[PDB]
């Protein structure tokens, strides 16, 4: 009994003491250490995934300090020559379990041969095969459980970083835009994947990628933070979309030709769009359609609620805006998305994430320099991430976005 | 090229004789024999586990025509002398192929003894190791493109039925109520593993179950079907519960305060509810009630829209039902759920599948007369199973319950 | 019961026949129809695997009718382009499955994708993914059951055609000479593989490979197939080597020194080499040395015993040869090898074997020449394979090695 | 290069510290620290399982000083109310890992409960789940590498100890006696599982069991020590039992008469046994009986060459003595036993393995009393196990073997 209770306040006093170095500096927690403390069980595990996340710390930390690009990529022998760590995507902790015991055994091997040898040794060049290691945290595919056995699976198998996406599980296609989550569910994981990483004792890093980019569909209207991103029927007259194509289930072919005709009566307009394109009708203009941009911006978490409020105050009539009659057959509300709705996620994901990976369809320089100036101008000190959807320039171009902030590209 | 177009075309023709036997006299498919076909790749494979759904579905027929109930339960030694089949549920897939092999071995260890032998064979006593096996597709969680390799998982590794429910994936909790989909969204996955089964070539049995019941949460109120039992507030003044905890984010044992001083500030009313006790301040009072019972009910299939219609020519005012403010903190809307639209949820998931699921928190006879009665009624030929959540007058309500119409129950 | 024995002799009856057609024209089975019915199951399972041995056969069949090489090698895409068949060597189960998952994946695919285009196919090439497969059942390394379960296993996962060495189990070095198992060992496990593909239902083909021309030990002498390439001391003065290697165990670069002293002192050659030698000491000189090399030859399968009795009514005394004294340090008996055992076993294995594999440790067509000549000579057809140990004239080599009679080789 | 040095002698300090502790009081290594230092990687990874390995050695430290029984068998709930232990045997590996994934997670889930609650735990009782484990390592079949990969995975999925039998691997029967290896094999075995232990950092336990008081075959008489069991028939006249069969291979139900008729034409006898029954005909008595038992005993290590040249200086003759006629088909000699072949085969084993295991067909407490002493007069703190092949009064005997130094049964 008296010892039990020891230990226990031993484990939370090391808990404390875990959270005090310069690792989580930036690292937002809403669970005590005596929780983490309780979750824990009476055999102290230590994986050498702990070690490999904190190699990979380090090297963040000094890429970052250097304005330095970290290079890599989704063969052992070349992935430690030419790269500083290795991103594994689809099953995936399979892959990350057998990439860390090829590690591993490669690193055996090195050091077998190099200790048998006694001058010949300088010759003779090394690899760091132990490279760390981020996982593709996308086959949970539902509620927080999941997510949580997932980072128990990944930390267990030699992960040093694990990724998730804001992007709806189950709905991934081969594609007419992604689907979004709240961003309070993405943030939701990440706190699991903390949690977890907390449990298990592993400074495993957390990488948040935003989708909203190129996503034109939102699982839900709950988040106040998307709510000026959701598409909505500025047409009273117009019915649902769903509705319609039920009620009227003609070949596809012909389908597409009604999902038209319902798209062009019904504008589909933010609401901040509708109430521009109103306040055009009838002088009342620069003065209120400032403050009305100044108060309901995308970087403002202003509800719908509050915008439309504001508008009533400042126009003097309830604009019509429906967003339920242009959810998908499924239910799935339009999402407009845009540069400025993946600097607000970002922004939003910053104090869970240790690394804001940011998708492009395309590359374009401006948009990548407005995403990292966003998210450094709400959060400073924050690691970005950037990749490219799948010339000579892409050297300049990698060495310009790793002065913006991004330390990871591949 | 004229050889594969002639193999194409008999294999189409094979696929059209194939759903002609009494195997498929009720079920409903919205894929084309040419699409199955071109699904199927060049080389023709049997599947055991057809034979195994075959001998199912003749046991299921048998049970109905005699009005029995066919036992089953969640060693194979003893699973065959009591049991009729096997309901496996939680890596499904691997107990499913487990069990399968198990059984494949006890029977070839049978035939070795009993072949051996050549008079004391009718000594010896003979069992079936062979049960068919009912597979949990609930590892799934996301999409289509899962339950469809799902099953096809389920058929390679000697499942004879699959079975799914209409509860949210990833929403199970250790319980504050089920979380359901919308009535399409359970259709398309039964549709999906009919769709799979009929690529791979099998007569495997779909089984769907329905949670109703017990649910009080539903993920997206796009299904006209589920806008009956949808729970809205009546009050114009409260605000949303999920915005007030966020901004009123006090000790959770606090906050219980603030969600019931908001439940009953908002009357959480079902639509019907709100009409029939508006309707009952100021007469109009028999006539009209009725009308809009019979033409507004659970088994009706109404939008709400439809609804707000009807009330609006019967009472004469709009009634105020905003089931946005009533959703939970993740977005799902109050269901209120309950026995018809259980039966709605049969009478929609009949044609799909060959047995209807109901789960019951407690085992009450009238409730599952009155659901076998329903369904029945909708569907007559409908093969139905029971179960309850986890004396001696068992026995007798079982087989009350079998001459209801459930021939499957554990 | 009288169904259950009518079943019984219906399945005895079908395997009688299926041991009727051209496939099973050179097979010899040890086990009655009876015993194989008798270990089948009341379910008949068919496997694709057995269609892939079906037209594995049949493309060795032409080859062999053609006199052409059916080229293989150890990315599915191209492996179909340029290849007949796959050879799966080291978990070999799982690549095997693997691999046929891959191959069946991408054949629906190009199925999918012809099928949905009619013109355009005929100039839309083809590609046969259905690779016959060949396994290497070497992770057995134990018994007779675990070949048996192998042989289940790689039956069930789509092998067309399963590989097996008479290398001893758990021997194999990264290399001072192979360690031989016994000709009947080898016998004995092709027979086992033959009887769990009779158990199966399935024409999986057993392909054999003999290394006694790079063997230098044998577990065992009990064959006395063996006994003219056993190697022994001619010196009654030497002790055994094993013991003075633990009664001396000085430094191992030392104990180098002492084995070759031993092997020094005592003169380590054939029976055949020791009477030869010997003989040539003292005229009794043609026809003696010709009569006991006639009967005393590689493909005589003479027991030393009756070699040293021949020996003795030749030359008049008793030859002393102790092959134990030349044991290794874990018994395993000095071994002669050569070709000409490569060509003995190579002909014992023929009855059990569809395909023999013949290795080489360096390409020498005179070695690949004799070989062909005396397995033909024995068996005439019997197909062949050949393999090298890990310029442009390997075009015509390969040719000519497939003129022989070699009909797969990589 | 200097780092790599100073980390490399550091590693080596510390291995050679390890070995200084009183867990490795009586443990004999062949290879060096350095040769355990290279073997290891760059990343030192520690495992619980030497943690569990500790505990392990303590309670059989605390049981052998009390001289008390530690009670195993082979439900997590009630394996730890009334066990110190689990031996888990027949794959096993993973057995294993999920029997220590179940005991971290009941670990963790008592812990939780207990941490929640602050007085109502002292009514509570404590379960500990973590038992340590006994993996049976006869999944290896082949040489030392599956041996050494084999005690990584038990030690990479919780394995407190690693339990090894010197029967030969592949040949278990469902039985006509046990085949057994040489004694220097097993040695071997058990030198490669503390190699690996070593490799890995762990203080896995080895555990040896001897099967040879129910042997009755042996692969190889390469091993001086086993050279006194080795059965050898007396009759010159008598030819090979494996020959004798395969040219007269008549019904096996008749074999069985050729068999026994061979069996009586042959004496088969031991060797001192031949030489005992020889002596007796023809005085010479007790003096060179006595003095010949003394020099040629069980526990002398004598081999057959040694005790045919003591029995010539004694009794005058060459005492006929062939045990390669008396082989099996396989080529296994025939092996005696007995219980001081067990006696002199745990001796050899003791300073290799933590537990020297003695199985017993029957129980017989002269047996194991006399297997106890033995072992204990040659190392005299050498921990014994005790177990039957698979009343009341089983209590007192339990005692009665744990005060004999059985300090581990079930």
Redesign the interface.
Known sequence: ?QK?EAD?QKEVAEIKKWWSEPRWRKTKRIYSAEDI???????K??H?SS?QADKLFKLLEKHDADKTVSFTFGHVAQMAKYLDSIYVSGTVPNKVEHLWFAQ?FH??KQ??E???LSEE??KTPYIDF?RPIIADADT????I??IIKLTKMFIERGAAGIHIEDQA????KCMAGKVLV?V??HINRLVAIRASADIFGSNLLAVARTDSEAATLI????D?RDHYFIIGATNPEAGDL??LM?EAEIYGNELAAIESEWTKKAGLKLFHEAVIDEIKNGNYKDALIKKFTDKVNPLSHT?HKEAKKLAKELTGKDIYFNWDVA?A???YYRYQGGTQCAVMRGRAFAPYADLIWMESALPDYAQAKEFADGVKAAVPDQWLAYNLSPADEQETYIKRLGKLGYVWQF
């Open positions: 009994i039990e226990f403390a309780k979750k824990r069980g009476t055999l595990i230590n050498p070690q591993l690193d055996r050091r077998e190099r200790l048998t040794r300088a132990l949970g595919h539902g509620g459980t999941a599980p189950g709905t991934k709240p309070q569910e699982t839900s209207t709950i106040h769903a509705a039920a509800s959810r057959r499924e239910g």
